[PDB]
Each structure stands twice: as C-alpha cells, then as structure tokens.
Structure 1
C-alpha cells in the first residue's frame, strides 16, 4: 500500500516541503541530547512503553506543536548502540495539542494539521543512529525535518515521477495520494 496523506484545507496550496520546513521551525528543538535529558520535560513517551511502542509521541517545549510516530518502535536507551530509535515507522502525524498516552490506550492530537501514512520504513538495531527511522524521528525532535522530507519525496516519486515533496497538497490529492480533511 502506497503513501497516503491527510491534510487540512489550510495547506491545500502549500508544497509538502514548505509545510514541513515551517512545521519544524514551529515545533523547534526540544534539546533531547546527551547530558540534556535530565527530567521528564523533553523525553516524549511510548505506547505502551516503557521503551517500545506502537506509538512514540513528543510535545514541543517551545509551542503547542506535537508529533506522533506510529509503527513498531524500539529505543535502546543505554544498551549498545545507545540512544537508537529503531524498528518500523509507518506513520507521522503533525499538529497541535497532544492528548492521551499509554495509560489511556493511545496518543492522539486534538488538532492535526497533516499526517503521512504507509511510510514503509524499517530500520534494524545494528545501524544505530545511522538508521533511517532514527534520523527521521530525531529530526522531528530537533528542528530539522530534512530526513522526513527525503523519505516522503522518494515515496511520492515511486508512485509517479511527476509527484514530489514540491507538489502542493492539492496536486497530491488530484493524484489520489492525499485527501483534504472533510468539510463542516
């Protein structure tokens, strides 16, 4: 099953690349880095956890932005290769106001902007932080969505070579890849 995109009508005339660059600058950087994860304020969380989930979600420390990564995800914590997020990444949902978590049966967003599904990414543990899943998710944590952009671009081009990260959301909808959020 090919990449599928949901978008708010707000972004109909935006390119995916422009949207993601703006979103990354808006979410910012939670400074989740060695020596800087010293309490619970910039960890994110897994469903179900503690270190593995069908979801990993993180709130911005700068804005009301959040993302939810869906798949079959694993974090090595202190085990070699340390601080590696790996496994299957099927979806990324971007928006405002993270809700829920493991204790309530899943994470959600009150105000999703855009989501990307059927990403088909799967990175093995032995690649460590060179894994694509790691780079995609860590990029979203740290204010740089270039890894995500690159993966979306490749998926779109494989559907049809006229599609790209520089297609508008409405162009992707005309191609059958994207769907605007229902009206009313």
Structure 2
C-alpha cells in the first residue's frame, strides 16, 4: 500500500508544505553539529538504543516540539562514514511533548499534530550523509523540512498526479490517503 497520513482537524485547510514549513520554524534548529553536541540536551534518543532502534525521537531545545522517526534506524557515531543516520524510515510523527523512551517500551507524543507513514525509505550505510533517510531526519533536527517535503511529494504523485505537498489535508483525505484525527 501507499503513504498514509494522520492529521489533526486544526490543519484541515492547510497544505502539507505550509504545515511542514511552519512546523520546521516552530521546532527550529537544535544545533546538532560538530563542536555543538557536548551533552545529551540536543542528541535525541533511540528505542531501544544506544545507537540503533525501531524509533529515533528528538525534542526541540527551542520549544515543546518533538518528532519520532519510526523504522529500523542506525547511527554510525564515530565509525566511517561518521555521524550517519541510516536504515529504514517508515514513519515520521510530528507534534508536542515527547514521552517515554527505551526504559518504558517506546516513545510517544502527548499531542501528535501530524504523522506520515509507509514512507518506504531505505538508505544504506555506504551513502553516508548523502542518504535520503539521513537528510530527511537531519532536516527535521536542523529546522529545514524540505527533504521530507520532497519525499512526501514523490509518494503523493505516485498515488495520483493531482496530489502534491500543495494539496490540503482534507483534499488528501478525499483522495483516501489521509484521515482526520477522531479526537481532533
């Protein structure tokens, strides 16, 4: 099957591009780069970890914004190619108030706004930071969601050429690809 989207009823009339652009600016840049990752405040975490998991989650240091990347993910840490997030990315959940972690059986968002599933991304280790999984996730860490937008757009086009990141969430629901959250 194809991409599947969950959205809060608040974003019915928003386009995906507009929402992601606003979400990016809200989450901001955690400043996760060489020389600026000195403690656990801007690293995020893996479930189960320490370097691999079915989830990678990160909260904003600017706000209550958080995301959860779901799939089969791996971080190289110091091994070559250095500082590469790779593997399978099935889903990205975006919202507020990250809860849980490895010690309590998984991460969750207290207030999920939007999630994208069946992304079908799969980047090998040998691509390093040129990998699509890497760029998508690092984009979300550093306040630029355009890599994610690009992948969502391709997945939507594949379902129908009239669907895009510029479609509204309601339009995407009308197309059978999205669904509004039962409790907003």
Give me the TM-score of the superposition, normalised by structure 2. Answer: 0.99
Is the counterpart of residue 18 in structure 1 residue 25 in structure 2? no
**Residue aligning to 2:129:** 129
Q: Distance in 2 between matches of 1:122 and 1:141?
A: 19
Look up the SS of the partner of 2:78 in the other structure: coil
Deviation at 1:178?
0.2
Distance 1:103 1:162 in 2: 44
SS at match of 2:97: strand
Q: Deviations over 1:140-180 (max 9, x none)?
A: 00000000000000000000000000000000000000000
Can you give the 5+ residue segments of structure 1 that lack an aligned partner in the other structure? Answer: none
Give the CA deviation at 1:128. Answer: 0.1
Which runs of no fewer than 5 residues in structure 2 stay unpaired?
none
Tell me by how many angstroms 1:136 deviates. Answer: 0.1
Instruction: Give the superposition deviation at 1:183.
Output: 3.9
The CA distance in 1 between the partners of 2:78 and 2:69, in whole Å, is 21
Superposition RMSD on alpha carbons, in Å?
0.7
- 1:79-105 Cα deviation digits (max 9, x unpaired): 000000000000000000000000000
Aligned length: 184
Alignment partners' CA distance in 1, 2:183 and 2:143: 31
TM value normalised by structure 1: 0.99
Partner of 2:44: 44
C-alpha displacement of 1:72 = 0.1
CA distance in 2, matches of 1:183, 1:78: 43
* 1:64 and 2:102 correspond: no
2: CA distance, partners of 1:88 / 1:34: 25
Deviations 1:59-96 (A, max 9, x none): 00000000000000000000000000000000000000
Equivalent residue number for residue 180 of structure 1 = 180
Runs of 4+ in 1 over 3 A off after TM superposition: none
Secondary structure at 1:152's aligned position in 2? helix
| Partner SS for 1:82 | coil
The separation in 1 between residues aligned to 2:40 and 2:149, in whole angstroms, is 28
Partner SS, residue 164 of structure 2:
coil
Write the distance in 2 (CA, Å) between the matches of 1:30 and 1:182. 32
